Structures are given as structure tokens and as C-alpha cells.
Amino acid sequence: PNIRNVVVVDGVRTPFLLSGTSYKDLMPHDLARAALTGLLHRTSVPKEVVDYIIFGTVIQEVKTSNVAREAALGAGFSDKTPAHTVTMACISANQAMTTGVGLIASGQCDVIVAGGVELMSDVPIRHSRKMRKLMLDLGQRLSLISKFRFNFLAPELPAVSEFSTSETMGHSADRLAAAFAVSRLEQDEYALRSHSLAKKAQDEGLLSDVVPFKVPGKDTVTKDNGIRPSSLEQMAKLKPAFIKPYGTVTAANSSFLTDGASAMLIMAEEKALAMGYKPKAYLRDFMYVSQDPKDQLLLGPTYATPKVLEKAGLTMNDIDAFEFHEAFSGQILANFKAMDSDWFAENYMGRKTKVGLPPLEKFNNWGGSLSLGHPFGATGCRLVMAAANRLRKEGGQYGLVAACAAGGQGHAMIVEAYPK
Amino acid sequence: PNIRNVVVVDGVRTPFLLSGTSYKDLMPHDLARAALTGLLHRTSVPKEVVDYIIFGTVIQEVKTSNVAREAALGAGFSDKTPAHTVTMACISANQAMTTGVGLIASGQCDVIVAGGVELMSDVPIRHSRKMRKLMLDLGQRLSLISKFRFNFLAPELPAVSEFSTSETMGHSADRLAAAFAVSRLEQDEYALRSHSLAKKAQDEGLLSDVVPFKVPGKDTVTKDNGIRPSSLEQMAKLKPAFIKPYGTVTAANSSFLTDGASAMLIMAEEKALAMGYKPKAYLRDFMYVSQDPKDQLLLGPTYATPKVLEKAGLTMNDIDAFEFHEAFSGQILANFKAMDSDWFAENYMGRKTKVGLPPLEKFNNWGGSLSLGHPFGATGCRLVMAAANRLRKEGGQYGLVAACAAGGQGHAMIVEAYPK
Amino acid sequence: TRTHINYGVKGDVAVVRINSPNSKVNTLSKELHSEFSEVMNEIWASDQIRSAVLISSKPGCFIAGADINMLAACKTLQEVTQLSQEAQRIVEKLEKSTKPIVAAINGSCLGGGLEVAISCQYRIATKDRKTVLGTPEVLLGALPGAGGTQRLPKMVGVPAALDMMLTGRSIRADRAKKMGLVDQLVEPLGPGLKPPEERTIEYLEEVAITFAKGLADKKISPKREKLTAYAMTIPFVRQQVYKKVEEKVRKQTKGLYPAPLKIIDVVKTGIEQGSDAGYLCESQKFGELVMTKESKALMGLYHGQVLCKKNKFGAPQKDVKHLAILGAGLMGAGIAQVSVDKGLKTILKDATLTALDRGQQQVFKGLNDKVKKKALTSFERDSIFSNLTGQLDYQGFEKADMVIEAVFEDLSLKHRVLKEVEAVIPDHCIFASNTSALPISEIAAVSKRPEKVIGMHYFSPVDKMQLLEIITTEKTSKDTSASAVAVGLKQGKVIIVVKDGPGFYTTRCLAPMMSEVIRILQEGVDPKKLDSLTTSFGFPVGAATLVDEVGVDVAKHVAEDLGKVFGERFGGGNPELLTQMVSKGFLGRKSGKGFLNSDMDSILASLKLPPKSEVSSDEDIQFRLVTRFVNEAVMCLQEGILATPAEGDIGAVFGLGFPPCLGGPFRFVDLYGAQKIVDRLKKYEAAYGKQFTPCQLLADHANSPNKKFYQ
């Protein structure tokens, strides 16, 4: 109760484009610079007060390592501001904010920038394990290194398979989907919702966490692209791609390869009231847990939430506004179905009942993932302002954000309303 | 004075090999596993008590991202232990310990593993910016994507050049070396020291922060390789490689491409006294600052140290044992020469005099970098135990560790003796 | 004695240093060689010292070229050839010494400095943007200070530097290694025990001395793939290179530059004839083309060129850091393209998104060609681009301190636009506008602040041309004017200050030229011929390309603007038909194709307006357009357009399109004489009697009592 508080300020997000449109020209530290300049466009903060910016990627474009250093130097920051990247699988950003709030509550620095930036358009296709031994080349020794050769030229691929179990995202996706009794019809009511709300959200136009910038190669501007509504009969015809047609995950109700960036600012409360910026939210407790990647691969959030509710000292139903992150349809309703019953908190911890009961009404109304795409390491640093401006818009004062990651890590943290 | 304390426990380091020897077979998350199993060999800790392991690379072998997750799962850890990597240029590890101590002093978790793991043997030579657009390939559209082609096959290289100024490590190295009046003879007295002490250090054999493991492809064991002593007359004949022969940095007194890993354990003090392990050191304050990469590129440590001395509230000369990290000879004596005079603290901050006076006697006696090689992102998590067991060995109680990074970031933190 | 040059002994090596504390930069002069003589002979009279090195210990440039007021110091032909024959005799002293020597370069070495540089055995240079290496020889129109062109192609080659020594343009130190003039590079330093640039000038002394001892005992040799193909191969292709260049120089320019081909005859005769005998041909040449009527006023052009790259208004108080560009398009994004790289924060106002795509694709497309020619790094490119944000409505003008309007010209809409973009701006600001026609004192009486409004008019392709012009009311404070011209010279484009008038200066003189561009095709003399006819007199772009330069839509407004006041009698004087040109709707440059177009002829044969007859040949109409242009250019300052008119055509030749190698419209009273032009229009006296009427101030001192303006 004597720990210094901590504050989210206005959360710039450059809009998410499906891959193949205007971000197929860019360079994977450039829209970092775009999102960060957009943060410095609506914050009016002197550029020397911003203390310790931290970003997070997943790809790590190796011509320029530690993205955040030169990505802050590119936007003209004063260069007495150290930086580092933080790489996880999926909640890279929203690991940025938690190490930032740890950096603040230690009581040594002033303000944090946290952001998440990636482009799955140019995936790194690297050359081979053994052709790169021709790095020994760089006058007869130059010949004798080249003397041993057969046809072993093959570019090995970064097949996103989590490597601990050697199988892609979708196998574990429809495993956990089918394991908790999810029909195809029940799995796509949510797919209908996660676009039907999204088009109305862009229609009223108050999802205003978006800066535009111009892509330097192609024509004009950007605005989000992954939003398309359809009917239920025009979805079940789509034959599923991740498994043979008995399964139940198709590309309609599933994430897609999209690119984008995000940033925010995190301030100590006392300098937030000394300088005089109007804040948005506090940033209270955070549990941070992992799951064994053989069984519960994408049972991310709902093994973590009753460990953070008891951490804060409150109850489930008296939260005011969730937003759970998705990566597949059905996954989130399996993260509805499993904990609206017994037997699963049973035998995977001791003696609780129904500690997940989300009433579905106070759920993802401003459409979360599957609405405007799922960047692979930049979600989360959308999600906090999509909690904050949301629970300011209606009443209520608390709300948890929780996300699942490729590898078993979960994330869950509660966010409180504006201090006025 | 009511902040919870924090403790370094025994710091395993797998030995550093010059590249081309037995680590040219490995896989860049494997000696992570070796160093971590070696940490679990001499700590006797139950494998379920270790809470939140964090590593740090610089290369990010992209077939398996977030190294620490599967690199903890590989050593048989209980998988209810979340993990992430932290990538900087050079002080990646020793950014690991500071985010760990921030994680502890927040007061939510128990114990931290911090380590740094890399192999510059297989550098990532990636394919091209535009051939990877043939990812669109993965029956006439398969032809029409292949229809546009000229000879533009060229593997672009990860030329380590820091990208903010488009020039390698050595240009800035001998610039800062020549700028502070360093002769060739004065630059290599230190080169003689940093091997002459090292061979005696391995001769007495008390540098005992080394586990062996077997390389699976090649024959037997490992032990450090970069140690060779010579005379001063057998060094000036080596013609310098980083610049035309008027310059003053050659490959003899300079870092070399070497590979290796390191880990440690960081404990809260109260559980360190409750379980009963004999600690090594406390881990007090840490300043963390950057420098503008046009002028002071490798003026890393000595712009950071008088910002941490006043942070802790003590004085320079009454420290007991330094160890400054090196990356080039001369650099460290330019980080002796500049601040043993005026005019440089002048005009780059306000009103100090001679706040760096290291008396050279309490310096790098157990040979630091250039002795047993400089891994590119794993130094530092050697350096803390090389401070700790060192200042236990003689008297004294305090000592600062400070390191410079490729990009302008510095690092400096004080380490106190054993609490008994 | 030792007034500017000195050495000492260290390492038993003579460190001769170059300095001149009087001026800011050091110049080659008689007053420098008068002591530079009796030092190297003492170096040649020594024996302990076995190597020497010269350097400019003053920071900045290395030396200048020919000192501007010494070659322009008027002297007779035998002495100007005697000095320019003596000036290389001192170079043929030291270029082949027994005791070898080393020079060094840490500045903008230009002009005769290469004479000092490449005469040496071994030079050494500093890789940064400030050091450039160029030969300003043809740009003032001469041959160099000691005739180094007879050992440049001995060194680097005929075809290699033949596109160097008469292209005029300089080279940075990076390409000079691949060229081969300087061989070794050394990058500068940052922080030192001494301030961070004084060591870099004292760093080269020791790199020079560690080269120097090696030269005495020969551990390194001075014998340092396209030129190697040429390197021995010219027995027969001789005419088949300089003939290709002979028509190259007259296809690039036109043949009425007698300057640059007169350095070709040097390198034409330097090959195949007596090389040492060739060092006296230019003694019979340098005295010719300096004492001629081609480049005599070109020295005065250079005096004004350096003279208006100066602040000239006191001291800059409260310098600007932010900008505010009201309106995208071709000027706004245009002036953003130049005002963004060298450290000015800018905000670019637009109306809708639909024109920012046409906006930033100038400030990007005209930028990365800059990195396509390797003049910048690939990284700093993008920070330069990200200094420019583009807003949509207003959020951020509270931080702004200087505003420039860029909206398409109107008296009515901008009258309001200044009234709604006044409130969200602080009081220590500057409002300014790039009007072309209507004056500012008509719109300076509207706003809340009367005194913080100036004008800045640009010119249309903003990158290539290189000047601004200032519009100064009655109410402009000295601080306002100084703060404006601070942006002017920090911009880099050479400024001129103008006290205003109805029609200020440049369109004020351009429309009385443009109103007779219809007059040649008013008879119908196939104005495709007129392009050759007017580029023959010297204008770099034809008058058809001038009306395709201005934009056809503003042509009616710049016809009506002073025709509202006095353009009908002498700001013009022909029937306007451009409204009939746009009656069909021709679009000018945005229609792509210019004028045969098959529809200009129907204009003149609408009703028979040209039965006209007068003896007006091509030379006649050339001097008609030029003499009316200079009648207007001498009309200025008769009302006092500014303080002293020697500041004049530093503007009016340098963006207006007036030919260099013609001294300027204010400079034809001198080498062509007011007497001769008044005989030209007195030959033209009975034509109309109305429009060509000469001014009174130039005419009274014109012919008889040998008076000039200031000379």
C-alpha cells in the first residue's frame, strides 16, 4: 500500500494489415519508428524526459539486432535513453509492460515506452546448417575449403512449430478444441460475433487508438483490413486446412498472417500529476504462468486467472469488463467451457469450483483478435487501451486482460479505471 | 532500507572456446542446456523451486525462438516456470540479472536464473530481401510467381556494424584509442598483463566457476583455449587489420570470435537463509546509461560510474576491487586516461573532477576479457562471480562491475561481499 | 619573416603550418607566397631535417583558390601573364625535390590548392562531409592558378578528369580514393582531452610524420581497371575522343561560352606535343580569357554570391526550430523537401488525405535519389524523413513559432485563412506567405499582430534553383527580418531583401518579358524556331518552356494583376490571348505534351491581326526582349526597390533564368554600355512610342559624360 503507483498514458497503435498489402515493402524496424513517432505526436512530452524505452519482436531481423536502440534513435530521441528488446513467442509486448512496471516500482527511473513490432511478411529463410561453413572462405586454402561439395543446397524453413513437440499451432488448436466438446456450429457463433461487432466498431469510429502513417513505397495511407462479415451458411463450406476434413478449425475462423506495431507510455503517478497529463488507468498486479506443452498447449489464460484474483484479493463475477485474447475460434470458448464445470480445476490444482465464470456479456465487445488480425508479437499492447477506453466508456472500474502464448506461457493482469 | 535484499549463488560458466574448435558442431540452444544442467549439478536445489528463468542471446536462431523456454524444458525443469529471452548487443547477460533483481524486489516471486548463451560460429547468412518473396509459392499462379527473374541471388551478410553509423567495431575502437593519446607501446603493456595473469590464474586452478561437459560430436571434454602469453617484441610485428598500418589496433590485442554460455542463480535473502544455502554476495544498486553513437561509441563504463557512486552514496577510491570489462586493448586504458584528467567530465556533465581514479592495482587481476575470450552476449554473467569469489579471496567488501556495449549502452553495478 | 607560415622541429621533421588570422579563411595570394618562398629554400638549405609536411593549422578549409580581389585586381596584359607565368615556377620548384615532402587535406580544398596538392608526392585526406575537393576553374571561367591541368591527366587520366576539371563540380573525399588523387584516408575523431575538433587538426601531423620517416628510407612507394585499359592506349583514337568532347561541350551548353573550350586546347596540345613546353601556352591564354568580356562581370557575380550568403541583419535573436506549412501541393511539399534535412522540425498542413500522397512522395522521392547517389547514409535518410509529420487539422500549432502559407493564390480565401489560423498560434511567431502576385500590405492590415508578418517567395522547382526572396512591409521589425533571414541562410539558399511595391520584383520583371512571348507568334514565325532563337542568345530554357514553366492557370492572373494598375501601357503592351488558350482548356505541364498541337494557328487566323511589317530579324527580337527586360530591371531602384542596386541581379540571374556569361541586366551599362542600348531603342524609336519608353535615371548619365553606376 506504500508501493508507488503506475499509469498507462495514450496507447498508439498503427493499424493491422493482412500480409500481402502495403507492408510487404517495409523493413522490420521501420513501422516501429512509425508507431513511436505517432506516440510522440499525441503526447506532447519533451523528448528528453522519456527514460527507458523497451520493445519486443519475435523475428529479430539480424542485420540490425536490438531493434529498440536504433528504433528510438531513428525517431530523433535523445540518445541518453538505454533500450532493449524482449523476445517471447506471442505475448512479447505485454511482457514489455510488466518488465517496465517492475522497472518503475523498483524506484530508480521515470517513464517507460513499451511496444511490440513485427512483420510476418518477410520470414527469415536461412541458408543451411553447412553451406554457412563457407564463412571459412571469408590462395589454395580458398580452393580447398571449396573442394568438398555435393548437392546439399536447401534453405531450411522457420516452420512455426514451437519445437518442444514438433507440431504446428493448428494441431494443438483443434486438439484442445475437440477435447472440450465443441461443435462446429457452436465454434462459429463466436466467429460471427468477432466480426459483427468489429464492423460496427469501425462504423461508429471511436476505436481511436490508431495513427495513420504513409507506406513509403505504395500509395496513400493505411486503415485496418481484416474485417469482413459473412453468414453462418457461407462459413461451413470452407474446408478445413489444418487437418483432414473430420476436424473443426478452418481458415475462416482462425488467425491470419498480419503485420503491425504498437506502443504506449507508462508513467509514474507522481510525475503524471506533477507534469499534468490526464492518465488513463492504473496498472495493478500480474500473474505470469506457464503450462506443459504436451497437454495444455493453448490453455493459456484460464490456468492463470484464479492465481491473479486471489493475488489481488477479489472475486471473479464482480469484475467489470474482461477481454481475453484469442488465437483461434473455439479456443476461447473452450476457455469458456472447461472452467464452467468441475474436474479441471480438480486434478490440476487443489479444491476450487467454477473460478472461471465469465458471463459473456462483458466480453470482447470491441472485437479482439480475429477482428482486426493477430500480430504474432504485438497483441497485448493493443489490448490494454482496448480495456482502458472501453471501461471508461461504460461504467465499472476493474478489468482483467489475459492472453495465451505459443509455448504454454499465459499472461493475466488487472487494469483499473481512471483515477478521477 | 526496507527493500528486500537479493543474493547471487554459485555461478556456473561453461568454458570459452575460440571458434573453429569443438563448438563448430553445436546447436545454439544446446550449450544453454549444458550450462543450465551444470547449474543444477552444484546447487542441489529441487527443480520445482526455481521460479522464473531468463536468458539472453544476440543471434536468435529462428528455428527455435525464445531460447529460454525450451532450453529450460530440455534440462528437465518442471514446466510451470515461465521464461523469456532478453536481447541486447553486448551486455545481454548483465541485463538479465538487473531485470531479475527488478523482478525479485517487486515482491512477487522466489528465485531467478540468469544466463547468456551464444555461438558466433554459425552466423545467420540469410537469403535475400526479394528471393524470400518466393514464399508466395508456398498451377499457373505457381508459374507466374516464378516468371519474373533475373540474376539477383545474393546472400546478404550480418556485418556487425551497429547500423546507426554503418561502420564496424574496430573503426570506433581505434578512433577512441587514438583520440586519447595512446601509443602502441602503452597499448600493449595491458595486453601483456591480460595474458600474464591469465596463465597464472589457470595454473593455480582456483578459477573454479567452470563446469565441463562433453561436445557430442567431437572427442572428450573442454577447457578454456584463448590463453597464450608472448613477448612485446613478438607483438608489434603483427600488422593491424582494422585499418591501414598507421593505426593502432591489431588482432593480437583484440577480441576474437568465441562461443560459450553462462548461468547463475539469484535468490531472495530470506529464502536463502530459510533453505540454508551459503550465499556469495548481495546485489546492490545499478545505473544503466547510454551514449550517442557518433562520438562516444565505446566510452561505455566511465560515463556511468559516477552516476552509480552517488546513487549508492560512497566514493571512488574506497572501493575495494574493480573489474571493468574490455572489448579492445587500449579502450580500457582510454577508460583510464580520459577521467584521470579534467575537460571530459567538464562539458559532458557539470562540475566534477577526477571521479574516475582507478589505482590499477585492484584491477582485473583474475584476467578479464582478452584473457579467456569475449563472447558477444555472455560476458557479465561471467563477471559477477569473478568479482565475488575474487573479493572474498582477499579482503575488502565492495566492488563495481561495469561493461560497455556495441551501441552506446553502458552498465555499472556494485556488488558487496558475503553477508557473514 | 613568419607572419602566416611557420614550422618547428619535432622528430627532426619540418612541420610547416598555414594560417591567416585576418580573414576567416586563408587565400592564396602574393602576400602569402612572398613568405612561402623563403621558407622551403631554407628547408632545401637544411640537412638534419629529412622530410617536411605542410598543413592548415587554422580550422576549416585548406586554402582558397585565386584570391578574389587579386585576379580581379585590374592590371595590363603583360603583367597578368607575367604573374600567371611566375605562379607555377614556384610549383616547378617543389614538385621534384630531392628531399620528398607530404601535404595533407582537412578542408574544402578548392582552386589553386590542388596546384599545391597534386604537385606533391603523396597527399592525405580526412573523410567527412566538410572536406570537399573541387576545382572552381570553369565556374568563374578561367584556367587554374598554376596550370595543374598539365599533370592531372598525367596522374589520373584524360577521360577520368576530363569530366572533372570542366564540369565545375566538386567531389567528396570518399570517391577520391577510387579516382586516385588522394590515396589514403583517415576519418576524424570525436571527444578528446582538447576540444573535439582541435585534436583532429593536430592528429594529422603525427600520421603525416609516421608516413614521413618511411618516405625518407623508402619503406612505402608512391607508385599507387578502366583507366588501365586506357593507360597506354592512345595512338590513333586521338581525334576520336576530343572530337566527341568538342561536340559534347556544345550540346550541353551552347557555343557562346568562349571560356571552357579554351582549356581543352591546353589538354589538346599538352598531349602529343612538348609537355614542359606546354606550360607556357596558358600564359598566352589565361591573360586572354580573364581580360575578356565573357567573365569580367563573373567576378562581381561571385562577390555577390558570397555577399548575400550572410546574415546582414544584426544578430539572430530567438532562432526557430519548428515550422508550419499551410497547404500541400508543389510549393509546400516542395519547400518541405529542402527545409527538412538540416535540422528543422516541420508540420505540413493539408485539407484532406487525398493530397498528402502527392505530398510526401515528393519529400521521399526527391530524397532517396540522394541516397541512390550515395550522398547520405541509408539510415539518416529515414530520420530526416521522420522529422516531417503531416497533420490534418490543427493539433500542434501551439508549439509552432514560424508559419508559411502555401495555398494557391487568391485575395479572398487567404484573407479568411489568415483569420482562422491566427488563434491557435503563439504571439512570438512569424506569419509569412509565398504569394506571387498580390502584395502583402494589402493583407498586412487584417491580422491581430501587424509587425510579425513578412513574406518569403520561393521559386518553382525548389531543389535545383538556389535562392529565396524576402518581402518586407513598412511594419517589419528588425528582429522579424533577422529571424526570417536566419531561416533563409540556415536553409542555405542565397537571400535577397526587397522593400516591396505593386508587383514586387521577379514576376514584376517577368510579366513584361512574358507579355511579348506572345508577340513572336503574334505574327506566326513558328515558335519552335524561337526556342533555338532564344537559347542562342543565352537563356538556358526557351520562352515556350518558360510559359510551360510558369503554369498556364496563373498566367491569366499575372496578366491581370499589374494590368489592373499599369500593366496595360508598360507592364505589357500586346493583346492578351491566353484566355483564348485556356478557353479550350489546355493544361500546361500537367497535360504533358507542350506546344505542334495544331491549334495555336487558329488563334492568329481567327481575325487577321498580323498584317504587320517591320525589319525585325532574330537578333532584333532578341535585343527587343532583352532591352525591355533591362528597361524594367533599371526601372527598379528608381523608386527605391532596395538600398543599393549592386545587390540586384544576384537574384535576377540566378533563379529568373537570365544567362550567365552575360553579366546581368543591371550589368549592361558597363560592357555593353547604356549608350549602345539607347542607340538600339533609338533605332526602335518610331515603332510604337508607348511601351518601350526608357527610364530617366539611366538615360541622363548614359552616353556622353562617361558615367557608370558605381564604377
- 3-state secondary structure labels for all residues of chain A: CCCCCEEEECCCECCCEEECEHHHCCCCCHHHHHHHHHHCCCCCCCCCCCCEEEECCCCCCCCCCCHHHHHHHCCCCCCCCCCEEEECCCCCCCCHHHHHHHHHHCCCCCEEEEEEEECCCCCCCECCCCHHHHHHHCCCHHHHHHHCCCCCCCCECCCCCCCCCCCCHHHHHHHHHHHCCCCCCHHHHHHHHHHHHHHHHHHHCCCCCECCCCCCCCCCCCCCCCCCCCCCCCCCCCCCCCCCCCCCCCCCCECCEEEEEEECEEEEHHHHHHHCCCCCEECCCEECCCCCCCCCCCCCHHHCHHHHHHHHCCCCCCCCCCEECCCECCHHHHHHHCCCCCCCCECCECCCCCCCCCCCCCCCCCCCCCCCCECCCCCCCCHHHHHHHHHHHCCCCEEEEEEECCCCCEEEEEEECCCC
Dihedral, C622, C628, C633, C634 alpha carbons, nearest 10: 120
Q: Which of A39, A404, A413, A414 is catalytic?
A: A404
**Cross-strand bridge partners of residue A401:** A323, A413
At B117 the three-state DSSP class reads strand
Distance separating alpha carbons of residues C334 and C439, to the nearest angstrom: 22
Q: Which residue of C has its CA nearest to A37?
A: C386
> For residues B343 and B349, is the Cβ–Cβ distance under 8 A?
no
| Partner residue opposite B87 with nearest CB, options A84, A122, A408 | A84
> For residues A243 and A174, is the Cβ–Cβ distance under 8 A?
yes
Q: Strand pairing of B286-287 and B281-282?
A: unpaired
Q: Which residue of B has its CA nearest to C204?
A: B246
Q: Which chains touch C (3 or more CB pairs under 8 A)?
A: A, B
Q: Which residue of C has its CA nearest to B246?
A: C207
| Phi and psi based region of residue A408 (left: phi greater than 0; alpha: psi -120 to 50; beta: remaining) | left
Q: Strand pairing of A410-416 and A398-404?
A: antiparallel
The H or E element that residue C675 is part of is helix C674-683
| Partner residue opposite B86 with nearest CB, options A58, A86, A133 | A86
The H or E element that residue B259 is part of is strand B258-263
Dihedral, B22, B23, B25, B30 alpha carbons, nearest 10: 130
Sign of CA dihedral C333, C335, C341, C347: negative
The cell numbers describing A37, all together, are 513517432
**Other beta carbons within 10 Å of C68:** 15
> For residues C201 and C106, is the Cβ–Cβ distance under 8 A?
yes
Residue from C259, C269, C322, C321 nearest C291 by CA: C259
Distance separating alpha carbons of residues A90 and A377, to the nearest angstrom: 5
At B281 the three-state DSSP class reads strand
Residue from C199, C184, C9, C8 nearest C103 by CA: C184
The cell numbers describing C23, all together, are 580573414
Distance separating alpha carbons of residues B280 and A83, to the nearest angstrom: 30
A155 contacts in chain B (CB < 8 Å): 127
B124/A79 touch (CB, cutoff 8 Å), yes or no? no
**B184 has a chain C CB within 8 A of its CB:** no
Q: Any idea what DSSP says for residue C28?
A: B
Query: Which residue of B161, B162, B165, B175 to mutate against C (max C Cβ within 10 Å)?
Result: B175
The H or E element that residue C78 is part of is helix C77-89
**Cross-strand bridge partners of residue B265:** B9
Distance separating alpha carbons of residues C402 and C425, to the nearest angstrom: 9
Number of DSSP helices (H) and strands (E) in chain C, helices first: 31, 18
B344/C207 touch (CB, cutoff 8 Å), yes or no? no
Residues of C belonging to the active site: 469
> For residues A304 and A404, is the Cβ–Cβ distance under 8 A?
no
Query: Per-residue DSSP letters for C606-620?
Result: TTT---------HHH
Establish how many alpha carbons lie within 13 A of residue C572's alpha carbon, considering only the half-sphere containing its beta carbon: 21
Distance separating alpha carbons of residues A270 and A279, to the nearest angstrom: 11
> For residues B418 and B392, is the Cβ–Cβ distance under 8 A?
yes
Distance separating alpha carbons of residues C170 and C158, to the nearest angstrom: 17
**B161 has a chain C CB within 8 A of its CB:** no
Q: Which residue of C has its CA nearest to B162?
A: C379
Q: Angle at the Cα of A49 (from B400 to A383), degrees rounded to 5? A: 100
Q: Angle at the Cα of C673 (from C668 to C677), degrees rounded to 5? A: 85
A81/B290 touch (CB, cutoff 8 Å), yes or no? yes
At CB < 8 Å, which residues of chain C contact A? Answer: 353-354, 356-357, 360, 364, 379, 382-383, 385-387, 389, 395-396, 399
> For residues C145 and C66, is the Cβ–Cβ distance under 8 A?
yes
**B164 has a chain C CB within 8 A of its CB:** yes
What is Dmax (Cα atoms) for chain B?
Answer: 78
B344 contacts in chain C (CB < 8 Å): 191, 193
At B262 the three-state DSSP class reads strand
> Going by C-beta distance under 8 Å and a sequence separation of 6 or more, which residues neighbour residue B175?
B297, C187, C189, C190
Distance separating alpha carbons of residues B411 and B94, to the nearest angstrom: 8
The cell numbers describing C617, all together, are 530579324
Using alpha carbons, list the distances in angstroms from residue C545 to A36, B27, C530, C659: 45, 67, 10, 15
Query: Which residue of C353, C386, C394 to mutate against A (max A Cβ within 10 Å)?
Result: C386
A79/B292 touch (CB, cutoff 8 Å), yes or no? yes
| Partner residue opposite C386 with nearest CB, options A70, A75, A219 | A75
Using alpha carbons, list the distances in angstroms from residue B50 to A203, B264, B369: 50, 12, 30
Q: How far is CA B173 from the centre of its chain?
A: 17
**Other beta carbons within 10 Å of B127:** 17
Q: Which residue reads 571561367 in cell numbers? A: C141
> For residues C656 and C509, is the Cβ–Cβ distance under 8 A?
yes
**Other beta carbons within 10 Å of B142:** 10
Resolution (A): 4.2
Residue from B259, B278, B373, B318 nearest B22 by CA: B259
**B152 has a chain C CB within 8 A of its CB:** no
SS (H, E, C) C148-215: HHHCHHHHCCHHHHHHHHCCCCCEECCHHHHHCCCCEEECCCCCCCCCCCHHHHHHHHHHHHHHHHHH
The cell numbers describing A248, all together, are 473443426
| Phi and psi based region of residue C674 (left: phi greater than 0; alpha: psi -120 to 50; beta: remaining) | alpha
Q: Any idea what DSSP says for residue B364?
A: S
B407/A69 touch (CB, cutoff 8 Å), yes or no? yes
Distance separating alpha carbons of residues B411 and C30, to the nearest angstrom: 58
> Going by C-beta distance under 8 Å and a sequence separation of 6 or more, which residues neighbour residue B381?
B11, B13, B93, B94, B96, B97, B114, B115, B116, B262, B263, B264
> For residues B260 and B373, is the Cβ–Cβ distance under 8 A?
yes
Amino acid letter at A325? H
Q: Strand pairing of A17-18 and A258-263?
A: antiparallel
**Burial of C377 (C-beta count, 10 Å sphere; 0-12/13-18/19+):** middle
Distance separating alpha carbons of residues C71 and C83, to the nearest angstrom: 10
Q: Any idea what DSSP says for residue B119?
A: -
C357/A214 touch (CB, cutoff 8 Å), yes or no? yes
Using alpha carbons, list the distances in angstroms from residue B271 to B41, B283, C402: 20, 15, 63
Helices (DSSP H) in C376-520: which residue ranges? 380-385, 413-420, 478-491, 506-514, 517-520
- Backbone angles phi and psi of C627, in degrees to 5: -70, -30
Distance separating alpha carbons of residues A235 and A221, to the nearest angstrom: 31
**Other beta carbons within 10 Å of C330:** 16
> For residues B54 and B85, is the Cβ–Cβ distance under 8 A?
yes
Distance separating alpha carbons of residues C237 and C516, to the nearest angstrom: 49
Q: Which method resolved this structure?
A: cryo-EM
The number of residues in chain B equals 420
At C498 the three-state DSSP class reads strand
Residues of B belonging to the active site: 90, 404
Distance separating alpha carbons of residues B264 and B381, to the nearest angstrom: 7
Helices (DSSP H) in C492-640: which residue ranges? 506-514, 517-520, 528-537, 543-550, 552-563, 578-584, 601-604, 618-635
Interface of B with A in 99-118 (CB under 8 A): 99, 102-103, 105-106, 108
B338 contacts in chain C (CB < 8 Å): 191, 193
B299/C184 touch (CB, cutoff 8 Å), yes or no? no
Residue from C135, C185, C132 nearest C165 by CA: C135
C193/B181 touch (CB, cutoff 8 Å), yes or no? yes
**A408 has a chain B CB within 8 A of its CB:** yes
Distance separating alpha carbons of residues C694 and C704, to the nearest angstrom: 17
**B303 has a chain C CB within 8 A of its CB:** no
Q: Which residue of A has its CA nearest to B20?
A: A136
Sign of CA dihedral A354, A360, A366, A370: positive
Distance separating alpha carbons of residues C678 and B50, to the nearest angstrom: 101
> For residues C437 and C555, is the Cβ–Cβ distance under 8 A?
no
Q: Which residue reads 541518453 in cell numbers? A: A80
Amino acid letter at C439? P
- Backbone angles phi and psi of C414, in degrees to 5: -70, -30
Using alpha carbons, list the distances in angstroms from residue C387 to A149, A194, B38, C367, C394: 51, 38, 51, 13, 18
Using alpha carbons, list the distances in angstroms from residue C685 to C571, C624, C681, C689: 18, 12, 6, 7
Dihedral, A13, A14, A18, A23 alpha carbons, nearest 10: -150
C377 contacts in chain B (CB < 8 Å): 165-166
Q: Which residue of A has its CA nearest to C380?
A: A74
Distance separating alpha carbons of residues A243 and A239, to the nearest angstrom: 10
**Cross-strand bridge partners of residue A21:** A19
> For residues B332 and B324, is the Cβ–Cβ distance under 8 A?
yes
**A156 has a chain B CB within 8 A of its CB:** yes
| Phi and psi based region of residue B349 (left: phi greater than 0; alpha: psi -120 to 50; beta: remaining) | beta
At C562 the three-state DSSP class reads helix
**Cross-strand bridge partners of residue C185:** C125
**A80 has a chain B CB within 8 A of its CB:** yes
At C105 the three-state DSSP class reads strand
Distance separating alpha carbons of residues C141 and B186, to the nearest angstrom: 54
Q: Any idea what DSSP says for residue C494?
A: B
At B68 the three-state DSSP class reads helix
The number of residues in chain C equals 711
Amino acid letter at C480? T
**Other beta carbons within 10 Å of B323:** 26
B156 contacts in chain A (CB < 8 Å): 63
> Going by C-beta distance under 8 Å and a sequence separation of 6 or more, which residues neighbour residue C688?
C573
Q: Which residue reads 527605391 in cell numbers? A: C640
The H or E element that residue C5 is part of is strand C5-6
> For residues B29 and B64, is the Cβ–Cβ distance under 8 A?
yes
**B173 has a chain C CB within 8 A of its CB:** no
C618-635 and C674-683 helices cross at what angle (nearest 10)?
120
Q: Any idea what DSSP says for residue C693?
A: P
Q: Angle at the Cα of C80 (from C74 to C81), degrees rounded to 5? A: 165
User: Per-residue b/e over C538-547, b at no fewer than 16 CB within 10 Å?
Assistant: bbeebbbbbb
B126/A129 touch (CB, cutoff 8 Å), yes or no? no
> For residues B236 and B161, is the Cβ–Cβ distance under 8 A?
no
**Other beta carbons within 10 Å of B305:** 25
B244/C184 touch (CB, cutoff 8 Å), yes or no? yes
> For residues C120 and C95, is the Cβ–Cβ distance under 8 A?
yes
Interface of A with C in 191-250 (CB under 8 A): 214, 216, 219-221
Distance separating alpha carbons of residues C702 and C626, to the nearest angstrom: 17
Amino acid letter at B356? G
User: Per-residue b/e over A112-125, b at no fewer than 16 CB within 10 Å?
Assistant: bbbbbbbbbbbbbb
Establish how many alpha carbons lie within 13 A of residue C308's alpha carbon, considering only the half-sphere containing its beta carbon: 26
The cell numbers describing C113, all together, are 590548392
**Burial of C608 (C-beta count, 10 Å sphere; 0-12/13-18/19+):** exposed
Distance separating alpha carbons of residues C331 and C339, to the nearest angstrom: 12
Q: Which residue of A has its CA nearest to C367?
A: A216
